[PDB]
Amino acid sequence: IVGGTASVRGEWPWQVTLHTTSPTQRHLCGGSIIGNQWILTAAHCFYGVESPKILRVYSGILNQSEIKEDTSFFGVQEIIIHDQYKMAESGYDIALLKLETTVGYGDSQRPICLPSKGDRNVIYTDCWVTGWGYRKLRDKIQNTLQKAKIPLVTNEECQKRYRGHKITHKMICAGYREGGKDACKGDSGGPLSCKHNEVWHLVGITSWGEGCAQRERPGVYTNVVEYVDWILEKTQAV
């Protein structure tokens, strides 16, 4: 996260850190708990991931330093990538991780509500992007989970800023015209959480942008409301 501050413990209890084991253990992506055996993340996170066996999901983490060989994690049973997904910039950047065991909800880890299909018309004024990503384009993964409040941008405005791209209604953009606050390397897959009527909703999934926090370059997120049916299809299969 660029231009963000340290989170307080338990502030974003749906936020997870997805680690890869191969070649060595390190943070790969962010993700969100949406169900007791479900993580919602970005499909691009799994470029070169040939098996779920190399993945470990950590919940209830504030600092990456809490993660050692003795730290409990959830194994991944299945990686479900949207079947229209080609690349982040083309859209359909969404994936589900089905966990091998059930998440026990508590004050440190609990799910985030999906947006309501009825809330396609709401104007979110309180949105936050969180992650352990870089603070600038040439940096390193951060120890403490960072947060940054970002304003949502209309599709029309975002399209003006991404000449040469097609910004679809399945994408949602966020950022300040002057830049300064945004997601960056290592934040992808994580949530864009918006508070509406005192309830937090998973409005976006950190996906892509041209650089980090640049002037007139908003961050591009998967527009979760447009994927509620796909999420229910995959999580509620008979």
Ligand SMILES: O=C(O)c1ccc(NC(=O)[C@@H]2[C@@H](c3ccccc3)CCN2C(=O)/C=C/c2cc(Cl)ccc2-n2cnnn2)cc1
């Ligand atoms: O340990 C590390 O050094 C370490 C180093 C980088 C990453 N991750 C990343 O760069 C991941 C990449 C990835 C992850 C997994 C598999 C394959 C591809 C794809 C891009 N990406 C982001 O995080 C996207 C960032 C991004 C998002 C928004 Cl909304 C705005 C601006 C952004 N940026 C523009 N230019 N940079 N950030 C993770 C870890």
